[PDB]
């Protein structure tokens, strides 16, 4: 029933791509790009091809689009037949892929019946593992059992076909034909694991993962470990339901409530006891990690070449302290924040581990709490019973901003942007005063750098403040105490931290000469020292400093920093 | 198709026609060549047949493969009528097609390219060679026990064969090569060269088949393959060899080269993020610029590449300088540690996880400059391979079957740091690093900072990386680039015996001193890297011979890396110097 | 001065054949369309005579024969050159190609020389469209 309505909608189809030109000038009238798009990729020839829903959802009233919608696998033969006889008639080897995109509804991996066999979807979610690329078969040359006669077979992209009749009369058997590779036609086919997001999880349910599969030039676009949004068509595999996507992106009384918390004075400090309200005490803990939360600029140079402008925060002290609480408020708040324990982890663990599979015995790379979570707080407790490789791992990943994984003849590098909050622990667990921060943390010199801020915490017998944390102990044991309480919720605090990460402050020039003359001052230290000093000072605790500079900045939503605000961070600095 | 018979007839009658040069067919000195030294490798320039037909070359370049099929049987032919009997040892000669016009990049190797004729540049890498491969295949059925077989190329794992023909079982099968094709292997992975890469882009990387030519290649040198595109199956090699200098910009090269004194503006465009000190970027400048190597009558090779050590506390900037270099120069290999590039320069046999078995490789810039990153970290074949590096100039592999010296004539731009982080001052360098002596000889520049607690580094420092942050004269970056290329594959400045003795002279008094006052002494090593230093300087100045006072700045840095390199108590050596200083 | 019997004859005669052969491997072809670009000419004709070759040398070779190649530049700022025939260069109307540049050389030669053996021509660089405005 659907022969003749085929070519309808093929000539319904050409006449969206025909009747629509460019008349764009002067922000005036819409009508579509998409002549000018072929005509653009005319010099080119890449024949991949971007057509948005969003506008082809207007003509016949959305009509059209219901029924493409439904009958999509058997309507795209058609669409690609008519798409063929445009850029026939309008321009003069020859592959085609047709990408929907920008569905006005997103779904989940859990929604999906096999009410939707065969019709359009949007799936996101993220990416688990990835697979090597592969050479799809497309078309094949067949030889006859007797004839010896070549015959061009093209496969329906289901699986390995084969002829029934042979063309010449000379025979008319039905045996084996042979595959032949010569007159063959190859390509890039990938097959990739999505998986369900961690904020649309039911209660006690388990995060429930599908493979993809990917063609045309949508492949080796889609980076391992980042949430992803694919549109594409649910096809299945003998049986499993899988999905096939053409299009790849990389995703992922308010305003007075806003502009109510940035008109006042006192914030800050509410910030500094809000940021962690189950914790007694530790205030320049609580700053670091508030602080830790937002960075500053990361392509400030004129070479070329970015920067680390990120901030390290790393917790040091003695052992049954409260220190593990803030590790567990931060992936308990944070939406970009990946736990690890430390032990139950490695090098290839950390970033990408590779898996075999059985099928041809190929490998499968899976990611990890690395590369993972971008511009977010990867949080690694027990940073001290790690071993060398992973630690020279964090330390390469630390050194370049980016990560190389070579493997099985493949070479792959991306873009990774983390703060690592560091949880370490002493080798006889209690601190000393005695010696340096070198020979009581453990651990070697370029893996001790590039991180901003050490906080020690030592204990001892305190009665005033230690009866207080003991009826603070006592006092939160029962049900949603009210002493926990913070002056103000997360609320307001998680669309202020977005609004201050989206600032970009500026600094300026009395800050900057108030600021040699600090780090001068804080070099002078150096000279007859080896009292409450307690390590060397370099470039590295400049560049700390000048970071936490627009952390404050942005913290106090101010755009020309004042080197006030940047004199709290030197008394940080000198705190540690 | 009978159009190949006309096609035969017409190049067998060519073949006995070309004479370019002097009346004389070259085709017959070519067929005895291959015939005399038994060889199956036919050389056919591309512009003498495409001047003799134009129709057989648009045939190559469209369909190769039955292009092919006309050119073996009609060289078997002048081979067999030229000479009796060749058959019975040699049943195929193949041939080899060069001079390709159209030189392809990786990057542009597309759809359109299809079953044609491609010439690319590159650089090979993942040796495995003769081995048996696969084309065709038979499967035993365990149930009834039964043979069945198709066809298996170069590209797929293997064809799961899962139906019977009368089990209708999907049984256990089992891989028969027992009766099957023929095996020819040279799985070579090729990559793009990093010195002709756009910036931002990532370098493409391909397999290729070599079939009939293998062990020929080098690894880790610049290739030429010319082969048809399906992966690429190479038919002709070239181990002989888009940022280069026109005839537009090699002019004002010299017309800048001869104002201005260009030495200290080269120094000061160098480092362009940070001020610095001219004794870092003095020994970089003379490390990748290089000298000369010269031999007498074929043996005694010097090494004309000038090896770097750098030295100090952690704090300092030392690899932002190779990360510049590392884009700045050409053919710039930054390695590091065990492996944290998965490069390396050692060769190794090893096992391998992607198809799980041994292989070999002699890991890798023949030309190029190496960078390595801490030094003082690394194991025993690294150091043991660059200290064989460092002494000739070859790297042998010794494995897996293979035997091959490959060349080593690389420049070693090293960083390292002392044990403890500070420099400890009042010990020389020898109890300061771990290192020994006869490594520490390979390098002639040792350059070393230190702590600097005064008022002018604190406002020079400071004030320069917070430019840097509140932003968001020299010689441009590019000019200079292309400079590097220009004068390194050009001149050869030599020296002339008119004056030159009074180094000898003054290499006589600072020998002696370096008895009496200190405990580390200069030998003629020195005197050949102050020779090379004089003749980068005299390259980089682009002259004709090496001046008089290019062995002065030769001599000053000399002195302020060997002085500097000792403890304080040769601090009369400071003063010992200052007479020719 | 100009000499271009012992310099010029021989050897831009021979730029021609080299230059003909790459206009038939790139715009002959029967995949992906695609239009003939000097970016990736030049280089061709440098590796057949191994010389350096400088881009005025085509426009010397469009001066001696003027109607084989358009000079029409690209809007990128790269300047194309096509054929006028759309069913291609057969290697008879190769040969026939090669026969009338040198025909057309020898009549140059030939005219020019009435003047005083090639007598005097530096082969002027023929004039490249401008852009308009």
């Not at chain 1, 050409?14 to 653009?40: H, M, N, P």
């Not at chain 1, 063609?215 to 999905?243: H, L, N, Q």
């Not at chain 3, 054949?17 to 072809?29: G, H, Y």
Request: glycine residues 4%; aromatic residues 8%.
């Amino acid at each position: 029933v659907d022969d003749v309505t085929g070519e309808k909608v093929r000539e319904a189809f050409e006449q969206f791509l025909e009747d629509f030109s460019v008349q764009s000038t002067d922000t005036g009238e819409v009508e579509k790009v998409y002549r000018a798009q072929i005509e653009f990729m005319k010099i080119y020839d890449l024949n991949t091809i971007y057509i948005d829903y969003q506008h082809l959802s207007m003509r016949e009233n959305g009509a059209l689009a219901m029924a493409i919608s439904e009958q999509y696998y058997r309507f795209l033969p058609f669409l690609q037949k008519g798409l063929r006889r445009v850029v026939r008639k309008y321009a003069p080897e020859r592959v085609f892929q047709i990408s929907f995109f920008n569905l006005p509804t997103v779904h989940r991996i859990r929604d999906i019946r096999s009410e939707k066999i065969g019709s359009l979807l949007s799936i996101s979610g993220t990416v688990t593992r990835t697979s090597e690329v592969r050479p799809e078969l497309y078309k094949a040359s067949f030889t006859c059992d007797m004839c010896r006669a070549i015959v061009d077979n093209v496969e329906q992209s289901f699986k390995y076909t084969e002829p029934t009749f042979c063309p010449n009369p000379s025979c008319e058997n039905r045996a084996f034909w042979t595959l032949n590779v010569t007159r063959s036609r190859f390509l890039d086919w990938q097959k990739v694991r999505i998986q369900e997001n961690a904020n649309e999880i039911p209660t006690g349910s388990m995060p429930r993962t599908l493979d993809v599969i990917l063609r045309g030039d949508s492949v080796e676009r889609a980076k391992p470990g980042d949430r992803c949004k694919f549109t594409g068509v649910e096809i299945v595999v003998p049986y499993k339901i899988s999905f096939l996507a053409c299009h790849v992106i990389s995703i992922g009384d308010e305003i007075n409530e806003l502009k109510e918390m940035v008109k006042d004075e006192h914030i800050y400090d509410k910030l500094v006891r809000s940021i962690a309200p189950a914790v007694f005490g530790h205030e320049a803990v609580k700053k670091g990690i508030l602080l830790q939360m937002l960075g500053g600029v990361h392509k400030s140079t004129v070479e070329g070449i970015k920067l680390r402008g990120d901030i390290n925060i790393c917790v040091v002290g003695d052992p049954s302290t409260s220190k593990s609480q803030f590790l567990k408020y931060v992936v308990g708040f944070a939406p970009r924040s990946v736990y690890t324990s430390g032990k139950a982890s490695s090098a290839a663990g950390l970033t990408a581990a590779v898996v075999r599979d059985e099928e041809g015995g190929d490998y499968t790379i899976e990611a990890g709490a690395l590369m993972l979570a971008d511009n977010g707080i990867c949080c690694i407790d027990e940073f001290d019973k790690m071993d060398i490789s992973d630690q020279v791992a964090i330390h390469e990943a630390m050194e370049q901003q980016t990560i190389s994984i070579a493997k099985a003849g493949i070479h792959a590098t991306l873009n990774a942007r983390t703060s690592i909050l560091a949880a370490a622990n002493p080798v006889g667990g209690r601190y000393n005063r005695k010696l340096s921060l070198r020979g009581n943390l453990n651990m070697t010199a370029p893996i001790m750098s590039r991180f901003d801020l050490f906080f020690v915490i030592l204990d001892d017998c305190n009665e005033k403040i230690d009866t207080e944390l003991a009826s603070h102990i006592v006092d939160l044991h029962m049900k949603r105490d009210e002493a926990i309480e913070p002056p103000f919720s997360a609320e307001q605090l998680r669309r202020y931290i977005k609004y201050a990460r989206t600032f970009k402050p500026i600094l300026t020039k009395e800050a900057r000469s108030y600021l040699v003359e600090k780090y001068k001052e804080l070099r002078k230290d150096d000279a007859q020292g080896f009292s409450r000093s307690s390590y060397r000072i370099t470039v590295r605790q400049l560049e700390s400093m000048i970071r936490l500079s627009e952390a404050i900045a942005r913290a106090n939503c101010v755009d020309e920093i004042t080197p006030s605000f940047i004199a709290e961070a030197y008394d940080l600095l000198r705190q540690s | 198709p009978n159009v190949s018979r006309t096609i035969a007839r017409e190049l067998k009658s060519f073949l006995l026609e070309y004479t370019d040069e002097t009346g004389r067919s070259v085709y017959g000195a070519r067929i005895r060549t291959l015939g005399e030294m038994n060889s199956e490798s036919l050389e056919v320039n591309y512009r003498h047949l495409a001047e003799s037909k134009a129709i057989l070359a648009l045939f190559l370049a469209k369909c190769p493969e039955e292009m092919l099929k006309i050119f073996d049987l009609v060289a078997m032919e002048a081979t067999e009528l030229h000479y009796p009997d060749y058959a019975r040892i040699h049943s195929e000669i193949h041939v080899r097609i060069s001079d390709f016009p159209t030189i392809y990049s990786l990057r542009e190797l597309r759809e359109s390219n299809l079953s044609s004729l491609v010439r690319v540049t590159g650089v090979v890498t993942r040796r495995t060679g003769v081995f048996p491969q696969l084309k065709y295949v038979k499967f035993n059925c365990l149930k009834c026990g039964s043979i069945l077989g198709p066809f298996f190329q170069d590209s797929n794992e293997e064809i799961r064969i899962s139906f019977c023909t009368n089990c209708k079982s999907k049984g256990p099968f089992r891989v028969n090569g027992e009766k099957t094709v023929y095996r020819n292997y040279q799985r070579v992975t090729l990559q793009e060269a990093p010195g002709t890469v756009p910036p931002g882009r990532l370098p493409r990387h391909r397999e290729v088949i070599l079939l009939a030519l293998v062990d020929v290649s080098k690894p880790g040198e610049e290739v030429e393959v010319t082969g048809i595109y399906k992966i690429i199956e190479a038919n002709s090699i070239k181990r002989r060899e888009v940022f280069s200098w026109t005839e537009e910009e090699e002019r004002e090269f010299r017309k800048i080269s001869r104002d201005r004194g260009i030495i200290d503006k080269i120094i000061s465009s160098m480092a362009p993020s940070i001020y610095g000190h001219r004794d870092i970027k003095t020994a970089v400048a003379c490390s990748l610029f290089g000298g000369v190597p010269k031999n007498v009558n074929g043996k005694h090779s010097i090494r004309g590449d000038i090896n770097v050590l750098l030295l100090g506390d952690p704090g300092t900037a030392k690899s932002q300088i190779l990360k510049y270099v590392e884009k700045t120069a050409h053919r710039a290999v930054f390695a590091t540690g065990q492996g944290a590039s998965a490069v390396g320069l050692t060769a190794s046999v090893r096992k391998d996880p992607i198809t799980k078995e041994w292989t070999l490789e002699g890991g890798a810039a023949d030309k190029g400059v190496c960078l390595i990153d801490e030094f003082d970290k690394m194991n025993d074949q690294d150091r043991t391979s660059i200290h064989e590096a460092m002494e000739q100039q070859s790297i042998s592999i010794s494995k897996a079957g293979i035997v091959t010296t490959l060349q080593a004539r690389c420049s070693i731009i090293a960083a390292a740091n002392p044990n403890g982080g500070r420099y400890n001052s009042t010990l020389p360098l020898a109890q300061n690093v771990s290192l020994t002596e006869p490594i520490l000889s390979r390098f002639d520049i040792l350059c070393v900072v230190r702590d600097l607690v005064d008022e002018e580094a604190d406002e020079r420092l400071a004030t320069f990386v917070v430019d840097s942050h509140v932003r968001s004269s020299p010689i441009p970056q590019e000019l200079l680039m292309k400079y590097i290329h220009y004068a390194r594959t050009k001149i050869y400045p030599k020296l002339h015996q008119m004056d030159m003795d009074k180094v000898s002279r003054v290499y006589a008094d600072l020998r002696r001193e370096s008895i009496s006052t200190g405990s580390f002494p200069i030998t003629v090593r020195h005197l050949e890297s102050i020779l090379r230093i004089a003749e980068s300087f005299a390259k980089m100045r682009l002259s004709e011979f090496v001046s008089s006072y290019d062995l002065d700045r030769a001599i000053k840095v000399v002195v302020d890396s060997f002085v500097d390199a000792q403890k304080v108590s040769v601090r009369r050596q400071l003063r010992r110097s200052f007479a020719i200083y | 001065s100009i000499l271009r019997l012992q310099d010029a004859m021989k050897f831009v005669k021979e730029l021609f054949t080299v230059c003909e052969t790459v206009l038939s491997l790139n715009a002959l072809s029967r995949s992906t369309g695609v239009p003939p670009e000097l970016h990736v000419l030049l280089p061709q004709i440098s590796s057949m005579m191994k010389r350096k070759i400088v881009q005025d040398d085509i426009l010397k070779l469009l001066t001696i024969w003027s109607d084989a190649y358009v000079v029409e530049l690209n809007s990128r700022g790269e300047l194309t050159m096509n054929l006028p025939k759309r069913d291609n260069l057969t290697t008879l109307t190769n040969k026939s190609r090669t026969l009338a540049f040198v025909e057309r050389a020898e009549s140059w030669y030939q005219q020019v020389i009435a003047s005083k053996r090639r007598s005097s021509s530096n082969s002027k660089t023929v004039l490249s469209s401008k852009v308009q405005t």
